Tab-separated table of C-alpha atoms and ligand atoms in Angstrom:
chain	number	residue	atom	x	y	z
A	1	UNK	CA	-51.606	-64.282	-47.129
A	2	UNK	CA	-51.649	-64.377	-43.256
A	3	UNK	CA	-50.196	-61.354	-43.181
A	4	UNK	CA	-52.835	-59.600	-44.777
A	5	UNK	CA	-55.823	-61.674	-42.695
A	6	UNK	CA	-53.989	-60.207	-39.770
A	7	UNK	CA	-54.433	-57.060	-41.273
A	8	UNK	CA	-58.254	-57.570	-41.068
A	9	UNK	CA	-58.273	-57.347	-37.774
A	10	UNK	CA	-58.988	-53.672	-36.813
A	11	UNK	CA	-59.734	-51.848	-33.736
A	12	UNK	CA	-63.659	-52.520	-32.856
A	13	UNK	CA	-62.918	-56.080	-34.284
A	14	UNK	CA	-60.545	-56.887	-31.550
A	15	UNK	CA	-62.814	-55.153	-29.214
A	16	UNK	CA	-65.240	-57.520	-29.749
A	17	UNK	CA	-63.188	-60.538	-29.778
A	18	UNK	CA	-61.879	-59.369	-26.137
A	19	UNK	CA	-65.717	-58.605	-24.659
A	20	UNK	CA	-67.572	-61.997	-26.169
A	21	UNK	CA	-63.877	-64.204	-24.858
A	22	UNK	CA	-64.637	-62.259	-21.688
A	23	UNK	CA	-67.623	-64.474	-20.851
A	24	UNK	CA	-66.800	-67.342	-23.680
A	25	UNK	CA	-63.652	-67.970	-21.845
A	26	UNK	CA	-64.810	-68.012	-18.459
A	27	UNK	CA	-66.078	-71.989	-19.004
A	28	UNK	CA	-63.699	-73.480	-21.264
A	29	UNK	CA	-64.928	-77.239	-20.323
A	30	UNK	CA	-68.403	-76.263	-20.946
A	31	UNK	CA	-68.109	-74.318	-23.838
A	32	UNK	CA	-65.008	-76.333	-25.298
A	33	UNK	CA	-67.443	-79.238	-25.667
A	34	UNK	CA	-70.582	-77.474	-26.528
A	35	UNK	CA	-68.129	-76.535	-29.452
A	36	UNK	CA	-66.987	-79.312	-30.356
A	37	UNK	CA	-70.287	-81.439	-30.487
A	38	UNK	CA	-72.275	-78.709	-32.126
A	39	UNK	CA	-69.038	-79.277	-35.019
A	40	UNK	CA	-69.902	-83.250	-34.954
A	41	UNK	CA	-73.993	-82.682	-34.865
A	42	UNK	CA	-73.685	-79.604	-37.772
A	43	UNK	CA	-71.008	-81.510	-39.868
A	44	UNK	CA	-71.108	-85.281	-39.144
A	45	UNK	CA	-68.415	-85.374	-42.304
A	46	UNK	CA	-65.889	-84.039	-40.416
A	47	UNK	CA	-66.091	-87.162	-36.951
A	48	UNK	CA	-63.988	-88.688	-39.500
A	49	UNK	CA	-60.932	-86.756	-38.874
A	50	UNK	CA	-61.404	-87.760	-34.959
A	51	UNK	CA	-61.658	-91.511	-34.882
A	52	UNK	CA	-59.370	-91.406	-32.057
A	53	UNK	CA	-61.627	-89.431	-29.711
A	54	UNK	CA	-63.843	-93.126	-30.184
A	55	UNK	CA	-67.610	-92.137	-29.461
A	56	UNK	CA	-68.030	-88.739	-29.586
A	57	UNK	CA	-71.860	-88.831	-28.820
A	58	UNK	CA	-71.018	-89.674	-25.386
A	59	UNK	CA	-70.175	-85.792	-25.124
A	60	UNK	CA	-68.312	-84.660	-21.160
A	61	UNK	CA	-68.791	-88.344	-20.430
A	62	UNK	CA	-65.857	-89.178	-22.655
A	63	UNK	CA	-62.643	-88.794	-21.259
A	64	UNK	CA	-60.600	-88.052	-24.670
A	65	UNK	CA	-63.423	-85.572	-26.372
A	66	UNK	CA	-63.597	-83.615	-22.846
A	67	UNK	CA	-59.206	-83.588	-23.066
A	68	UNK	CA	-59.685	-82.066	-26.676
A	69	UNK	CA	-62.282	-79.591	-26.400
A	70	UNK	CA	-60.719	-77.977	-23.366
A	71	UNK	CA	-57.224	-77.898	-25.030
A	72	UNK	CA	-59.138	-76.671	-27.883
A	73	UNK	CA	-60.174	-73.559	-25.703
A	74	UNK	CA	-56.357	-72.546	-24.676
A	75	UNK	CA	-55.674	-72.212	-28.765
A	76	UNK	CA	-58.630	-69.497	-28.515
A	77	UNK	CA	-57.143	-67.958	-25.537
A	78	UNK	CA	-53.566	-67.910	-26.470
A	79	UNK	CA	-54.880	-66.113	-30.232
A	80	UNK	CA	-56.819	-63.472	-28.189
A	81	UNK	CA	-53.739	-62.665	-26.253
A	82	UNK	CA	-51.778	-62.148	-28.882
A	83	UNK	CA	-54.104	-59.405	-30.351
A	84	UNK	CA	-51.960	-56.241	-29.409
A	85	UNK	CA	-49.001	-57.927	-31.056
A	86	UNK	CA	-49.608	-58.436	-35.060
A	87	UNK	CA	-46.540	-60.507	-35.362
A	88	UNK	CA	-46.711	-62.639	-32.731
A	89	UNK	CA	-50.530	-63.222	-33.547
A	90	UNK	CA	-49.340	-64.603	-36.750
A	91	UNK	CA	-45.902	-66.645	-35.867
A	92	UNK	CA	-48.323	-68.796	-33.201
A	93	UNK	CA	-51.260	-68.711	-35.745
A	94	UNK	CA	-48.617	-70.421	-38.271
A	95	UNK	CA	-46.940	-72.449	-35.745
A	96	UNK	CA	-51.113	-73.436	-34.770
A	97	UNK	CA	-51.369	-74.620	-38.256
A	98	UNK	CA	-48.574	-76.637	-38.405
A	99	UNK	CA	-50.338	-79.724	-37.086
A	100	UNK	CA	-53.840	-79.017	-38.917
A	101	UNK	CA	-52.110	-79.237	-42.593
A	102	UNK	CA	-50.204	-82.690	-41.370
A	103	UNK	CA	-54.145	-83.894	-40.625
A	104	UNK	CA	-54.512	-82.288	-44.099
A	105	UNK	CA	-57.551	-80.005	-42.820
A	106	UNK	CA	-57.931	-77.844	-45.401
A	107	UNK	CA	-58.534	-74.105	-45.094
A	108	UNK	CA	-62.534	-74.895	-45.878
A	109	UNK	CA	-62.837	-77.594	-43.715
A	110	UNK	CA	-61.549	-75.359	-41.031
A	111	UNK	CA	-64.140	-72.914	-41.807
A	112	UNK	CA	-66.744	-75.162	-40.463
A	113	UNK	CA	-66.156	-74.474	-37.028
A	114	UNK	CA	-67.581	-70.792	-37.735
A	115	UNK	CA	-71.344	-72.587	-37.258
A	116	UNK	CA	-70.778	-73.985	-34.147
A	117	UNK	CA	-68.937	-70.875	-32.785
A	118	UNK	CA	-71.955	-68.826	-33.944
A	119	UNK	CA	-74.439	-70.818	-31.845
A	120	UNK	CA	-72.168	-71.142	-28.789
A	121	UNK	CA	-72.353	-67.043	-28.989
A	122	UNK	CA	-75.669	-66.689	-29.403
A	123	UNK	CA	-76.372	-68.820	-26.493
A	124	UNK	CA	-74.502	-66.710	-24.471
A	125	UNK	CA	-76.834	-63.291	-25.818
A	126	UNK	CA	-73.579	-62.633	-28.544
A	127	UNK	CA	-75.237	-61.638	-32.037
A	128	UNK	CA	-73.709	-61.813	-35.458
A	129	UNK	CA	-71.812	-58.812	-34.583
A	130	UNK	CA	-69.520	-61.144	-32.728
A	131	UNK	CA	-69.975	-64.071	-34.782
A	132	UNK	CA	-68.347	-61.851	-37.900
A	133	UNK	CA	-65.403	-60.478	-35.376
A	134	UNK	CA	-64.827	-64.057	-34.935
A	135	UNK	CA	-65.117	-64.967	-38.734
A	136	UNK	CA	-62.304	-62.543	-39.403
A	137	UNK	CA	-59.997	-64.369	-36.500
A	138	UNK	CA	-60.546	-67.823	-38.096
A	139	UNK	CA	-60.198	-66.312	-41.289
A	140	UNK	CA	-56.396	-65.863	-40.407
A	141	UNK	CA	-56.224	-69.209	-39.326
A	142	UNK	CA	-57.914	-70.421	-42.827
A	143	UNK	CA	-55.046	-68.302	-44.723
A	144	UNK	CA	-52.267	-70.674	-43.381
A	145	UNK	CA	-53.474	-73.867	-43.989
B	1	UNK	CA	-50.848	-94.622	-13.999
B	2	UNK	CA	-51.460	-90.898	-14.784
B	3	UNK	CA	-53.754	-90.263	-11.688
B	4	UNK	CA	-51.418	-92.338	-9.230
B	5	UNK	CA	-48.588	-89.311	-10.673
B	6	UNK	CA	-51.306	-87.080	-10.147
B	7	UNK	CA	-51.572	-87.913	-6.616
B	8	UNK	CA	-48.226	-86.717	-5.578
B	9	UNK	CA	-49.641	-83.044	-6.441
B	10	UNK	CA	-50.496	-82.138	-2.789
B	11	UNK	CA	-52.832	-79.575	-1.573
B	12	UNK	CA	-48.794	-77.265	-0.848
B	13	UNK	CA	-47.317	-78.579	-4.022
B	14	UNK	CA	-50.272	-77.153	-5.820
B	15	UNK	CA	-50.264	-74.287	-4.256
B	16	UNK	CA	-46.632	-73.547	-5.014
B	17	UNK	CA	-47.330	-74.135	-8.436
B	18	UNK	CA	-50.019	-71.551	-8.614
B	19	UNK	CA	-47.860	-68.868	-6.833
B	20	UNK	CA	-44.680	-68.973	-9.075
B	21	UNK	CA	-47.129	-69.151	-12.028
B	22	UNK	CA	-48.776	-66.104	-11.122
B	23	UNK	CA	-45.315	-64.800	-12.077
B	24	UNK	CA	-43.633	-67.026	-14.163
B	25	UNK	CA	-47.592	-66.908	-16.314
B	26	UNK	CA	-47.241	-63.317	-16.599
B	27	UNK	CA	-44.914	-63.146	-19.526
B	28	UNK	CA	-45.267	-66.401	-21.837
B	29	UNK	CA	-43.022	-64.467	-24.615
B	30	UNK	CA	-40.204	-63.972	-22.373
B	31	UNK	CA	-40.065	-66.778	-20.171
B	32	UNK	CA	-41.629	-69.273	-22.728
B	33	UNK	CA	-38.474	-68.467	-25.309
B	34	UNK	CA	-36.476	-68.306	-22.050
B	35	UNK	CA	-37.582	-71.817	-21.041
B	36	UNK	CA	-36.820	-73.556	-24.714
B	37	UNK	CA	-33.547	-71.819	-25.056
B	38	UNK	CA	-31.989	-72.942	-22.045
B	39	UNK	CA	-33.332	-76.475	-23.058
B	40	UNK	CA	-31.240	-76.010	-26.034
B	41	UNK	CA	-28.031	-74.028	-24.397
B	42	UNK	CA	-27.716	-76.884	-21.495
B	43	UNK	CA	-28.954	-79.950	-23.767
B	44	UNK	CA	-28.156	-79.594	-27.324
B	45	UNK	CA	-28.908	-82.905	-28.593
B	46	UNK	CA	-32.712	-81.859	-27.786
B	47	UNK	CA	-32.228	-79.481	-30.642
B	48	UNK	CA	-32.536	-82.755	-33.244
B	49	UNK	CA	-36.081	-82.719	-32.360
B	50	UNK	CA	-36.768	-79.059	-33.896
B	51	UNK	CA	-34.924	-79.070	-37.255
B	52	UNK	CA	-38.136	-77.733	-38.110
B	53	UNK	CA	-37.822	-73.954	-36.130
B	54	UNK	CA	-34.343	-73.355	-38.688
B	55	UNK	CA	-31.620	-71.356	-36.715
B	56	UNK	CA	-32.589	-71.756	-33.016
B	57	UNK	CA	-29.670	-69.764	-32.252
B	58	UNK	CA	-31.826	-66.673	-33.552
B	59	UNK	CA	-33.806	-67.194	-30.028
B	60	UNK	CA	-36.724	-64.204	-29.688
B	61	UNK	CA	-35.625	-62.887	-33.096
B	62	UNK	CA	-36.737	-66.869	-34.325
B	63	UNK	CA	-40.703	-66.532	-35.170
B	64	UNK	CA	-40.872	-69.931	-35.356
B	65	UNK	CA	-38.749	-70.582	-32.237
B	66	UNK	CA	-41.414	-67.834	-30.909
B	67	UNK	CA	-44.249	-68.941	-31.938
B	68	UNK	CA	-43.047	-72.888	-30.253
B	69	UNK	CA	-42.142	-70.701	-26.978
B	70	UNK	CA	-44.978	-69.169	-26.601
B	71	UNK	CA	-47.675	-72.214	-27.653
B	72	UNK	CA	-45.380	-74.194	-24.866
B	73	UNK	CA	-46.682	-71.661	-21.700
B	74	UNK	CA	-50.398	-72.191	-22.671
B	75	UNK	CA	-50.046	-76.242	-22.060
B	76	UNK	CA	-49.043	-75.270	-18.659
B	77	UNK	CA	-51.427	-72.334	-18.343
B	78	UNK	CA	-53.673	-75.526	-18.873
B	79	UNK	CA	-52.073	-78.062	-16.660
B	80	UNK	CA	-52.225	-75.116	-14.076
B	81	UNK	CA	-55.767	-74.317	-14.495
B	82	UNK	CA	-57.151	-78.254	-13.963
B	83	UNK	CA	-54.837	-78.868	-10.494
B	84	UNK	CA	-58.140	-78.740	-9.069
B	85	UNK	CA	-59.979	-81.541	-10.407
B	86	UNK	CA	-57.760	-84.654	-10.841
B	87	UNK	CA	-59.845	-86.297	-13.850
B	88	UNK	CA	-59.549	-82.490	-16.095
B	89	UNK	CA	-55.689	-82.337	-15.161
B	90	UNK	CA	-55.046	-86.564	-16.290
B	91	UNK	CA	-57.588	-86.089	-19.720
B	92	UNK	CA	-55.664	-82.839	-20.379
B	93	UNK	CA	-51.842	-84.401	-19.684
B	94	UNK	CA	-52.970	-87.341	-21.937
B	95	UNK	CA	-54.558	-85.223	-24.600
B	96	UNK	CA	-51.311	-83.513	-24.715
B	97	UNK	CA	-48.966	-86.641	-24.488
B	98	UNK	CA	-50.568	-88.071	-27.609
B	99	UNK	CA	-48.136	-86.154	-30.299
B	100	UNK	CA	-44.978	-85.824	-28.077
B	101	UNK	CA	-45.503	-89.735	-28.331
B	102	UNK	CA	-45.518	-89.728	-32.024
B	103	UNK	CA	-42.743	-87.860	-32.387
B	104	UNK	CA	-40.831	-90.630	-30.208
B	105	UNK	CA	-39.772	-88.279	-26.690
B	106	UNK	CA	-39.344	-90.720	-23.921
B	107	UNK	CA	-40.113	-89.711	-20.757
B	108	UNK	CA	-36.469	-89.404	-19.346
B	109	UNK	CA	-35.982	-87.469	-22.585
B	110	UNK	CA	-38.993	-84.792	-21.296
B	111	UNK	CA	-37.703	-84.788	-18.368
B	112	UNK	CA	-34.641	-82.336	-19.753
B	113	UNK	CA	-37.135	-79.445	-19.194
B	114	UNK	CA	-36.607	-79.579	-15.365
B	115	UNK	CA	-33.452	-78.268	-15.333
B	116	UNK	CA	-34.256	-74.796	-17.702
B	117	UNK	CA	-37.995	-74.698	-15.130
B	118	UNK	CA	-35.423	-74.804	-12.034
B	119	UNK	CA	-33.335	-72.050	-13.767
B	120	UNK	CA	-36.169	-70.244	-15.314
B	121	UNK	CA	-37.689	-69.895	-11.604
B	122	UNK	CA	-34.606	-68.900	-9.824
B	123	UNK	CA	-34.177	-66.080	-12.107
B	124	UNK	CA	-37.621	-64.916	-11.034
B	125	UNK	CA	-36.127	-65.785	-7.155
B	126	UNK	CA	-38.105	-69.090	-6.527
B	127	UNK	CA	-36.176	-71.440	-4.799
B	128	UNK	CA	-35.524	-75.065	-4.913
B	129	UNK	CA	-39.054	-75.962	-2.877
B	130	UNK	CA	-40.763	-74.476	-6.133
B	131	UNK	CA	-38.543	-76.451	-8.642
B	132	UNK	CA	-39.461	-79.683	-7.049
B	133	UNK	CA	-43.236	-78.593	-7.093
B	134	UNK	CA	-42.691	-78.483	-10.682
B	135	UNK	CA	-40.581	-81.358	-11.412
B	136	UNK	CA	-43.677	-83.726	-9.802
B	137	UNK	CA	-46.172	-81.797	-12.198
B	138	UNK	CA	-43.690	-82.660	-14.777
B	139	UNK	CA	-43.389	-86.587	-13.076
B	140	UNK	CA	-47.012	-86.647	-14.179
B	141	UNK	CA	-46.586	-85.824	-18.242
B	142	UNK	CA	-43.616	-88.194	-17.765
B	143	UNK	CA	-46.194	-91.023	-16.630
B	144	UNK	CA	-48.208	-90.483	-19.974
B	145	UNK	CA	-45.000	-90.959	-21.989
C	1	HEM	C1	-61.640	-73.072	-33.379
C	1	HEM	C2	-60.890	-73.995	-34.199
C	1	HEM	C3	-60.012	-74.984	-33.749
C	1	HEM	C4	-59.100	-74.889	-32.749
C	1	HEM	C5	-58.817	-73.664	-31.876
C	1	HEM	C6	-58.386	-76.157	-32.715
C	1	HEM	C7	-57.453	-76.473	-31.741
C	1	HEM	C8	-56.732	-77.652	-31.714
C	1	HEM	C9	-55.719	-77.960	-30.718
C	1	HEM	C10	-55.149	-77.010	-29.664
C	1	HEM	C11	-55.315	-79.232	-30.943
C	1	HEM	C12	-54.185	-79.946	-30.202
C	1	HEM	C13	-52.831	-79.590	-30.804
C	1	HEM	C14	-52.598	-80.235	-32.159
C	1	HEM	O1	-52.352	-81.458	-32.189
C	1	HEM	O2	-52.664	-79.522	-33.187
C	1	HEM	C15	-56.084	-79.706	-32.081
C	1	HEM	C16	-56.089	-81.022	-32.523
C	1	HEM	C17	-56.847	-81.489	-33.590
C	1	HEM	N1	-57.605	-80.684	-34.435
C	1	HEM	FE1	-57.923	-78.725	-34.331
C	1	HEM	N2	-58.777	-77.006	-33.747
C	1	HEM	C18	-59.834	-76.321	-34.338
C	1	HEM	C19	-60.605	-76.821	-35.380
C	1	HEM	C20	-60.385	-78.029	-36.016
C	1	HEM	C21	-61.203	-78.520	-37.115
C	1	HEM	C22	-62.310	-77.731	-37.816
C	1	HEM	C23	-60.766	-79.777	-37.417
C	1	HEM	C24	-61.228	-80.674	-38.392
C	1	HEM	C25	-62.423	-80.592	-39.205
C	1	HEM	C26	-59.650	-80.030	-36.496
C	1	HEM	C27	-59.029	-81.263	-36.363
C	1	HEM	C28	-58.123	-81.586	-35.364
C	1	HEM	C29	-57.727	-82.952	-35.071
C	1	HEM	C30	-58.101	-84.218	-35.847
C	1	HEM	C31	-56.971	-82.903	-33.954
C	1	HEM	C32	-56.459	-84.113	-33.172
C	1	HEM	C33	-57.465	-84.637	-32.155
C	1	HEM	C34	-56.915	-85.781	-31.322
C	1	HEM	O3	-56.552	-86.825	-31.902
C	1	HEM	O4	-56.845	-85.636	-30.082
C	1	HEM	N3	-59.396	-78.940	-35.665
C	1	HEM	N4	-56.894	-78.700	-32.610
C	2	HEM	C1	-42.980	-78.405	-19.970
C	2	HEM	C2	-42.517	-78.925	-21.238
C	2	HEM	C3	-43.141	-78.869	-22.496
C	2	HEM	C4	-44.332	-78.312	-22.857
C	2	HEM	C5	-45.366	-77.646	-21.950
C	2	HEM	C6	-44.484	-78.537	-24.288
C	2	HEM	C7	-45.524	-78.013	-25.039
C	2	HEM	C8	-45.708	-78.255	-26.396
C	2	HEM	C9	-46.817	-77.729	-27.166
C	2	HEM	C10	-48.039	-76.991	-26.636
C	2	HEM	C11	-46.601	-78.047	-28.458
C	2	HEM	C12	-47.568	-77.753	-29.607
C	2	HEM	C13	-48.588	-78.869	-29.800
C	2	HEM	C14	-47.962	-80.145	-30.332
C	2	HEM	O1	-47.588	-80.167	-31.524
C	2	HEM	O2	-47.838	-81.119	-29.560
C	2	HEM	C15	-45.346	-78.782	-28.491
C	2	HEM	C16	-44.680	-79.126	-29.657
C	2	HEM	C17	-43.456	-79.779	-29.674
C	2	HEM	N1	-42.802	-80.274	-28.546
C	2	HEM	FE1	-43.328	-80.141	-26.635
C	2	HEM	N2	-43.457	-79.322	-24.804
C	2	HEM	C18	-42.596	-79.467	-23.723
C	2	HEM	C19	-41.362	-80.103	-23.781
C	2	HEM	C20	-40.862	-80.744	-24.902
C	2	HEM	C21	-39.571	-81.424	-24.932
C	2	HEM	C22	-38.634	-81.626	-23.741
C	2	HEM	C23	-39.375	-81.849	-26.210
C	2	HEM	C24	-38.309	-82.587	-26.755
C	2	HEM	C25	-36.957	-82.707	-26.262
C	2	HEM	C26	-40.563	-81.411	-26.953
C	2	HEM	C27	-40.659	-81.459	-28.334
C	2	HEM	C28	-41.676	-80.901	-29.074
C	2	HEM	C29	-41.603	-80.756	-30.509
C	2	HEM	C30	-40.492	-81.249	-31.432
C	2	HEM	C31	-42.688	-80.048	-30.881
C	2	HEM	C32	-42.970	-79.553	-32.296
C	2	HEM	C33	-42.265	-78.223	-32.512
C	2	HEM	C34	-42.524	-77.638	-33.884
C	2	HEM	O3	-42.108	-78.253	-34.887
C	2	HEM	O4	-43.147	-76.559	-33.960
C	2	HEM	N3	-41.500	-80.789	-26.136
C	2	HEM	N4	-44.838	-78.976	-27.204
């Protein structure tokens, strides 16, 4: 359950996840799309669930895929605030995943996003120390959907 | 029609905004659930559009009246952020517009929320000259609607 992801989430982990949003969060536009495009380059399967967004290869040029990946980032931020607080971590993780099960994203399709998070870490000098921290936050996410 | 809205947001109204967010920002729980229940308490009908959140009359106790409440401050720790750059802010509002539209919320309906903002800020002593700031950032969500 979500309640036991939460669980997950000890001490050093939320460290971590506070130090690496530190400098992730500092350039939400840059690093919202970087995200987002590395998602649509590593898993072309999944552009299907974003026909809206039109021509996602046009990257910051296009209007509605730059709108997306920077509200993207303010999902991130809002989780990482909610860190000291187990339950409100999890009513805005479920209230998060509300939308995603409408779009019927299912908990592995969600996971895919841990690739491009991975890279977007490492090119800011983050190893897979952080890129398992953030495994376990997305892993809470992944037990709601 | 988004950026002419977005023009009224002058270099003061802007700045006004920033300042009462600074407080207003500072506790999302509290003023979030704070915002959404005085939408409720001084509009009731708008309550037909959560049926979803169960007994709204719960308030903080609510996690899923929570959870809403507290998601709602990080679209305007958003809005806030892009005030700066005129084609972030409009990409952002319409980004965000997109599923208020779906679930049918006129603009004159959204515009309900200035009266609990006008309330919300006087409690934290901002006067009228910050509620209008806020009802023209609110003008330009209404202009995506
Ligand atoms: C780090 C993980 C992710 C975060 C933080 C995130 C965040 C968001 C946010 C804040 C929204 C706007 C609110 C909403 O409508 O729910 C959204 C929309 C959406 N998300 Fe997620 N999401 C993530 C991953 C994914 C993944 C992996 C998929 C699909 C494979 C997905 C598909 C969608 C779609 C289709 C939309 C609507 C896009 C549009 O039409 O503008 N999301 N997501
Ligand atoms: C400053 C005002 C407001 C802000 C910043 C705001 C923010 C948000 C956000 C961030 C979400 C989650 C993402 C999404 O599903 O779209 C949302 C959901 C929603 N909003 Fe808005 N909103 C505002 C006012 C309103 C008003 C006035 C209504 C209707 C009278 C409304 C009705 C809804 C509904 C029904 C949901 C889904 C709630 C749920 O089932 O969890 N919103 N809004």
């Amino acid at each position: 359950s979500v309640y036991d992801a939460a669980a997950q989430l000890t001490a050093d982990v939320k460290k971590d996840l506070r130090d690496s949003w530190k400098v992730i969060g500092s350039d939400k536009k840059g690093n919202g799309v970087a995200l987002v495009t590395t998602l649509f380059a590593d898993n072309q399967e999944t552009i299907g669930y974003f026909k809206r967004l039109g021509d996602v290869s046009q990257g910051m040029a296009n209007d509605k895929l730059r709108g997306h990946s920077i509200t993207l980032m303010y999902a991130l931020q809002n989780f990482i605030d909610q860190l000291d607080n187990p339950d409100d971590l999890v009513c805005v993780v479920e209230k998060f995943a509300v939308n995603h099960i409408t779009r019927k994203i299912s908990a592995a399709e969600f996971g895919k996003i841990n690739g491009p998070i991975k890279k977007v870490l490492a090119s800011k000098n983050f190893g897979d120390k952080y890129a398992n921290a953030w495994a376990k936050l997305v892993a809470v996410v992944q037990a709601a959907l």
